[PDB]
Design a protein around this ligand. Structure first.
Ligand SMILES: O=C1C[C@@H](C(=O)O)NC(=O)N1
Ligand SMILES: O=C1C[C@@H](C(=O)O)NC(=O)N1
Ligand SMILES: [Zn+2]
Ligand SMILES: [Zn+2]
Ligand SMILES: [Zn+2]
Ligand SMILES: [Zn+2]
Ligand SMILES: [Zn+2]
Ligand SMILES: [Zn+2]
Ligand SMILES: [Zn+2]
Ligand SMILES: [Zn+2]
Lengths: 362, 362
C-alpha cells in the first residue's frame, strides 16, 4: 500500500547551469529532484555567470525552461553593485539570496551597509533568504528589524543558530528558517569516514549536540531544504575541495526513515516540504501533481544515486526505510521506480503563472 | 487597479442547514462567503440534527452538495456518546469540533474524561478544533499533551488566551489558533450601541485591552475565521437572544481596512486567510480560483449585508476601505459587484477530491 503525498518543494538547490554543467545541469538536477519526490525546486544564483542582473536572469530562465523536468523558480543574487537595480525583474524571481559568509560563491558583500541597502531596495513583499551562519544570523536579523521586514535563514546547522531563531520567534519577529538533511543525519562522527575533502560543506557538519538540538527544536524549523550542492568526486577529493553535498535523491528517503521511527510525523514532514515552502515563498499549487511512496521498503544508500552528476553521496552506507515509487506532475507520469519519463523542458517557471505572482499593494 | 488574491478559506462558519434555515442555509451562506471573497468554508456541526453520527453527516453532505455555491468541508461534532464510533467517516470531515463551554450548541461534554476519550479515539492525523475559553484553553491543551497530539483553538478573544497560547508555542507545543473579526474590531465600548441582545456572542466581546493584546500578538494568530453565526434580528432582540454574529460579508473588508492603515500586511492577511487554513486542515487548492479586490473604495457598513439571512450586522456604521469586486471559482465567474453568478450546488466537498484527503500512514 502506497502513501500519496502532495508535490514536494525544495526551496534550496544548486543546479549549476549556466557554467558548471559537469557538476549538474537543469536536466540532471531536476531528474534527481523527481526521483527524490520533489516536483518544484528553487534554484540558487551562484552560477557562472551568477544570476545578479536582468541579462543573466533572462539566460537562466531560457536554460531552465529548456532543461528542467520539474517546475521551478529562480533566485536572484545580491551583489556589491546591484542594490536598487533589480526592481523590474524582482517579481519574476523566487526571491533574493544574500551570501553573507564564505562558501561556494563570489557574491561577496563586504559591509553590513550593503545588506541594509538590499533590504531597503528589494521590494518589501518579496522573499529574502540568507546564507548566515553563527553570529551572522543575529546580524542579518538586526538588519531585517531596522528595515522592518522578514528574512528566511537558509540551512540552519547549529544549536546556537536554532536557539537564536527560537528566541527571535518568541519576540514575534518575522523570521523563518530551513534545515538540510545532512545537518540532521550527519555529524562530526562521520568526518573520519568521509575524509576532509568529501566532508567539506558550508555550514560545516555539526557536533552530536548540534544535531540533537535541531531535532529537539523541530517546532522552530519551518522548512526542510536539501542545499543540493553537487560537485564531482574528483573535485571533492582534489587539491581545493569545494564545499557542498548532493542531496535531492536522498532527502526524502532519510526523512521517511525518521517518520517510520517516530522522530517526527508525516504531517511534520509535509509542513516542512510542502505547506511552509508554499507560504513563505508564495509558490503556487501544481495541478494534478502527487508523489507515491512505499514506507516499508528497506534499502542501503549506495556510493552514488542514479541521477545527480555529482556521482557520489555522503550518506553512503546509511540504512533507510521508505522510497519514492511514482511521481505524477501536471497530469503525466514523471517518474516510476527509477525511470524518469518527462523530457528536459517539461518543467515551467512558476513565477510566470498568473497564480504564481506574489500579491502586492498597487 | 485591482489586487488579485488567492481563494480565501474560512475554517469556522455556521450555515444552519439542516434545521435552522430561516437563519441561513447553504445557498445563502455560501453566497455571503463569495461576496466576502471566501471560496471555501468549513461548516460547523451544531445544526438540527447535529452532525454527530454517520447518518447526520450523510444528510449534511447531500444538503451541502445541493445548496453550496462555494467549495466546503463539513465538521463532525463530538458528543457524550460518539467517541470511538466515528472512525469510518472521520476522514471525510473537515475535522472534529469539541464544544467545551456554554454557547449555541447542545453538544455538551460533562467531563474532561470525555475530552480525553475523543482525543484518544479520533484518528491522530485528523484535525481537532475546540471552542475553549479562558482556563478551558489550558485544560484542552493539557488533554492534547496527555494524548500526544495537536489542537486548534477556535475564536481566541482575550489577552489571557492569546498569552497562554503564546507560552505554549514557546514550549514547542503543537497548538494553533484563529481569531474572529469581532474580537479585533469590536469591544465593550460597542455594547451600548449594540444593546444586550445584539451584543450576545461567545466568546463575549472583550475589553479594549483584550483587543489590543490580540493585535500586539498577531504573530501568535495562525488564522482569521469569521465564526459566522447568523440569527435573525427578531431572535437577537427577543426574550432569549442566541449568541453569535454574521460575519462572512464583513470579514475581508474589515481586514483590508486594517491593511490599508498599516496594522498588518497583505502577506499577514494571506497567511491567515489562505496558507495557514490550508496547512492546518490539509485543505486542497482550488484550481482557477481567485479574488479581485479594490483597495481604494471607501464605504460604510450598512444595517444589513445583502446575502446573509441574518439581515443585520454588528459592524453597522463602521467605515471601511476595500471591497470585493470579482470572484472566479473553478474557472467561472462566481461573484461580480454584488451579483452571485453560480447556482446552489456549484460548490463541492473538498474532502471527496483525491487531493483533499488527509495523508496518513497505512
Ligand atoms: O553556501 C554554500 C553553497 C554550496 C554550493 O556548492 O553552491 N555549497 C556549500 O557547501 N555551501
Ligand atoms: O460557540 C458559538 C456558536 C455560535 C452559533 O450561533 O452557532 N455563536 C456564538 O456566539 N458562539
Ligand atoms: Zn519548459
Ligand atoms: Zn548556503
Ligand atoms: Zn546553497
Ligand atoms: Zn501566497
Ligand atoms: Zn455540488
Ligand atoms: Zn464557538
Ligand atoms: Zn462557531
Ligand atoms: Zn496537506
Amino acid at each position: 500500500k502506497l502513501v500519496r503525498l502532495p508535490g514536494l518543494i525544495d526551496v534550496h538547490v544548486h543546479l549549476r547551469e549556466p557554467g558548471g554543467t559537469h557538476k549538474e545541469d537543469f536536466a540532471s538536477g531536476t531528474a534527481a529532484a523527481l526521483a527524490g519526490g520533489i516536483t518544484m525546486v528553487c534554484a540558487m544564483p551562484n552560477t557562472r555567470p551568477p544570476i545578479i542582473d536582468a541579462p543573466a536572469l533572462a539566460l537562466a530562465q531560457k536554460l531552465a525552461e529548456a532543461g528542467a523536468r520539474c517546475d521551478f523558480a529562480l533566485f536572484l543574487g545580491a551583489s556589491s553593485e546591484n542594490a536598487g537595480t533589480l526592481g523590474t525583474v524582482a517579481g519574476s524571481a523566487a526571491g533574493l539570496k544574500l551570501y553573507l559568509n564564505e562558501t561556494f560563491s563570489e557574491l561577496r558583500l563586504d559591509s553590513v551597509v550593503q545588506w541594509m541597502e538590499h533590504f531597503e531596495t528589494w521590494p518589501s513583499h518579496l522573499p529574502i533568504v540568507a546564507h548566515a551562519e553563527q553570529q551572522t544570523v543575529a546580524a542579518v536579523l538586526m538588519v531585517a528589524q531596522l528595515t522592518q521586514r522578514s528574512v528566511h535563514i537558509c540551512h540552519v546547522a547549529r544549536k546556537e543558530e536554532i536557539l537564536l531563531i527560537k528566541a527571535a520567534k518568541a519576540r514575534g519577529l518575522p523570521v523563518t528558517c530551513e534545515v538540510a538533511p545532512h545537518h540532521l543525519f550527519l555529524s562530526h562522527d562521520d568526518l573520519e569516514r568521509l575524509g576532509p575533502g568529501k566532508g567539506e560543506v558550508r555550514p560545516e557538519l555539526g557536533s552530536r549536540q548540534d544535531v540533537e538540538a535541531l531535532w529537539e527544536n523541530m517546532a522552530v524549523i519551518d522548512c526542510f531544504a536539501s542545499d543540493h550542492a553537487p560537485h564531482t568526486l574528483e573535485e571533492k577529493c582534489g587539491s581545493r575541495p569545494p564545499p557542498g553535498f548532493p542531496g535531492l535523491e536522498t532527502m526524502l528517503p532519510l526523512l521517511l526513515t525518521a517518520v517510520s521511527e517516530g522522530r517526527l510525523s508525516l504531517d511534520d514532514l509535509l509542513q516542512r516540504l510542502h505547506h511552509n515552502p508554499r507560504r513563505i515563498f508564495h509558490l503556487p499549487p501544481q495541478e494534478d501533481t502527487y508523489v507515491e511512496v512505499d514506507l516499508e521498503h528497506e534499502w542501503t544508500i549506495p556510493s552514488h544515486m542514479p541521477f545527480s552528476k555529482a556521482h557520489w553521496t555522503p550518506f553512503e552506507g546509511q540504512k533507510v526505510k521508505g522510497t519514492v515509487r511514482r511521481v505524477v506532475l501536471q497530469g503525466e507520469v514523471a517518474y516510476i521506480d527509477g525511470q524518469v519519463l518527462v523530457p528536459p523542458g517539461y518543467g515551467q517557471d512558476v513565477r510566470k503563472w498568473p497564480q504564481g505572482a506574489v500579491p502586492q499593494l498597487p
